[PDB]
Amino acid sequence: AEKPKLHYFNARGRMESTRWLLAAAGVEFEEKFIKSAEDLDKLRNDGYLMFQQVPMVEIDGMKLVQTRAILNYIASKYNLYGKDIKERALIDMYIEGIADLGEMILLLPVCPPEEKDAKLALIKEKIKNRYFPAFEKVLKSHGQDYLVGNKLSRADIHLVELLYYVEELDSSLISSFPLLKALKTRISNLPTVKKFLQPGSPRKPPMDEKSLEEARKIFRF
C-alpha cells in the first residue's frame, strides 16, 4: 500500500516518537518537510489537517493528525500494542507516564527565561523520584527484557527514546536505575533501532536556537 508519509518540520518536535516507532517496526516511510508558513497554510487550506496542526501522517488512505492517533494506529498495525485489552491497558498506563514526562522536557525551551532554571530542577526531581522508580519497578517485577508480556511493544520503544532525552538533559539521572540502563542497551541493539541510531536515518538532532527560530516563523509563536 502507500509508504507512510510524515508531514512535519525538519526537527524532532511532536513527530519524533512516530519516526522512532516506525523505524523500530522496520517500516519504510517518507517525510515531507514544511519549510515555511506557506507550506503549512497550503496543507491547512487543502483540508489535510483536521485541526490545522501537524504532525500529520498519510497512511492507509487517511490524513491522520494527532500524535496519539498516529501512534495508536501504527502500534496496532505492526503488532506493538500488546495481545489483548489487558496488555493494552498496561501499555497505555506506562506510555501515558512517558508522555507526561516527555511533554515537560519538550516544552522546557518554551519556558520564560527566568522560570527555566526552576522548571529544570522540578523535572529532575520527578525523573529521579516519580518516573524512573515507576519504570524500574515494572522491570524488576518480572525481570524480563521487555516492559509488557515478555515481547517488544511500543512501550519499550517510547521509553528508550525518552531515556536518550533524559541523557541529554543530565547523564546521571539514570545512574541509580540499573534495569533502565540495561533496557536502553538492549533496545538500542535491536537491528532496526540500531540502524535508526546510526547516521543517515530519519532520526533528528536536538533542537538548537536556529531550528527554534524556524518553528517560530512557520507555526507563528
Next chain:
Amino acid sequence: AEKPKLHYFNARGRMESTRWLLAAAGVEFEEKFIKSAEDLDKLRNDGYLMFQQVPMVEIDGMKLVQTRAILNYIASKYNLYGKDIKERALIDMYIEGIADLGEMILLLPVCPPEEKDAKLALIKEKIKNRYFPAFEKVLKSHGQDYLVGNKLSRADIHLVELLYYVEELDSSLISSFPLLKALKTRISNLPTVKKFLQPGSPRKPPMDEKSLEEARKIFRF
C-alpha cells in the same frame, strides 16, 4: 463482576470524562472520594498509584491510572472504540482534538489571573474557527447521526460532554453549528445519558474557587 471503583476528589477534574463514558455505557460504578492529603498519601503508600497520581480506577483486577489508559480500556470493553483499527484511528484523531480543547478549558481556572482575559479570547476563537468547524465538517460530510461508523462511540460521548462545558462558558459559541446542536440533542436523549444528565446522578458540577482550594490542600499545589 464487581463495579469499577473510581478514586478521585469529589469534583469533575480529570475523572469526569470517565464518569460520562461509564454512564453512557450503562455501567454502574462506585466512587471513593479523596477528602484529605492523608487520603492521597494512603493511596500512594499502599502502592495503588503507579505514578503517585489520580485518577485511578479499579476495574477487572487492575489499578489503572492515567486518564487515557482508563478511557481506552472502558471504550474497548463496551464496544465504543469502533469496529477495527481504521475506525479507531478516526475516533482517536477526533477525541484527541476534543482532549486538546478540553484541556484548555479544564486549566482555565488555574491560568495566571493576568493571562486569563487574553487566553479566554484565544479559546473562544479556537472553538469558533478550529474545533467546532472540524466536527461540523465530519458530520456534514457523511450526513450520519454519529461521528464514526454510523454507530455510537466514545467520540460522540466525549464531544457532547465538551459541548456542555462550552455551553457553560458561552452559550452562543455553538450557534452557527446546527449539526453539533443536533448531535447534542440526540445524544442527550439516549436513555443512559438522559439519566446521567438528570439531577441525582454522579455527574459533577462546575469547579468553583473552593473546590479548587480543596485540591491545593490535598495535592499540596
